[PDB]
Structure 1
Amino acid sequence: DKATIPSESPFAAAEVADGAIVVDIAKMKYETPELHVKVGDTVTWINREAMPHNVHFVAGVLGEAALKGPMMKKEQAYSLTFTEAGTYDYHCTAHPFMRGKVVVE
């Protein structure tokens, strides 16, 4: 696998620690659609909207299986720790027009 999952289910935005690498989900978009991080960094998505959202990486991208993240309710968060360099495209399962990528360098 190319990422580890600190928490399989979502957690409160507030519980996100100061200085976390946050991608906001707001205005029906991933507000940083192309994020560049380094190996070992944790990325945290935070849903700011009433509509639930997730992140979904198809099979072969983060590992063998698809990573279909849990739906974050408003003001919930979800993290992935990237362990290997690459470019990792994702979308929202419910709203597949919402697309982003994490470039791990």
Structure 2
Amino acid sequence: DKATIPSESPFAAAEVADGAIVVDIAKMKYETPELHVKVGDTVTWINREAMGHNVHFVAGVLGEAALKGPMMKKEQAYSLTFTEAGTYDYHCTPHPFMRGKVVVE
């Protein structure tokens, strides 16, 4: 896979890891819709809003399978550790007008 999943469950915003690269979700948007990171980095999405959101990568992007992340409640978080250079587009499953990308290089 081009990413590993530290936790299949969301977890509390306060539990975000030192060194994680944070993307806030607020105002029905990924607040950093184009993020550039290094191989080995952990990206953590944190939902800052009442409405639930996830991150969803279709099949062939992070590996063979689609990665449909868990729904994050307000002040919940979810991480992916990127292990290979590339450009990885994602969207929010319930809100597909929410689009983002992670560029690993």
- Between the aligned partners of 1:23 and 1:66, the Cα distance in structure 2 is 21
Gaps of 5+ in 2: none
Deviation per residue, 1:51-74 (Å, 9 max, x gap)? 000000000000000000000000
Give TM-score scaled by structure 1 length: 0.98
- Between the aligned partners of 2:50 and 2:61, the Cα distance in structure 1 is 28
Instruction: Kindly state the Cα deviation for residue 18 of structure 1 after the two structures are TM-superposed.
Output: 4.1
Deviates most, 11-20 or 27-36: 11-20
Instruction: Kindly state the Cα deviation for residue 17 of structure 1 after the two structures are TM-superposed.
Output: 3.1
- Between the aligned partners of 1:94 and 1:79, the Cα distance in structure 2 is 19
Residue 53 of structure 1 aligns to a residue whose secondary structure is: coil
- Between the aligned partners of 1:5 and 1:19, the Cα distance in structure 2 is 16
- Between the aligned partners of 2:83 and 2:24, the Cα distance in structure 1 is 22
- Between the aligned partners of 1:20 and 1:56, the Cα distance in structure 2 is 19
* Count of matched residue positions in the alignment of Structure 1 and Structure 2: 105
- Between the aligned partners of 1:15 and 1:40, the Cα distance in structure 2 is 19
Deviation per residue, 1:83-102 (Å, 9 max, x gap)? 00000000000000000000
Gaps of 5+ in 1: none
- Between the aligned partners of 1:84 and 1:44, the Cα distance in structure 2 is 17
Segments ≥4 residues shifted beyond 4 Å? none
Instruction: Kindly state the Cα deviation for residue 19 of structure 1 after the two structures are TM-superposed.
Output: 4.0
Residue 14 of structure 1 aligns to a residue whose secondary structure is: helix
Task: Go from structure 1 to structure 2 and tell me whether the alpha carbon gap of 1:24 and 1:85 turns closer, same or farther (over 3 Å shift).
Answer: same
Report the identity percentage. Answer: 98
The answer to whether the 8 Å contact 2:20/2:41 transfers is no
Give TM-score scaled by structure 2 length: 0.98
Deviation per residue, 1:11-48 (Å, 9 max, x gap)? 00011134421000000000000000000000000000
Instruction: Kindly state the Cα deviation for residue 80 of structure 1 after the two structures are TM-superposed.
Output: 0.1
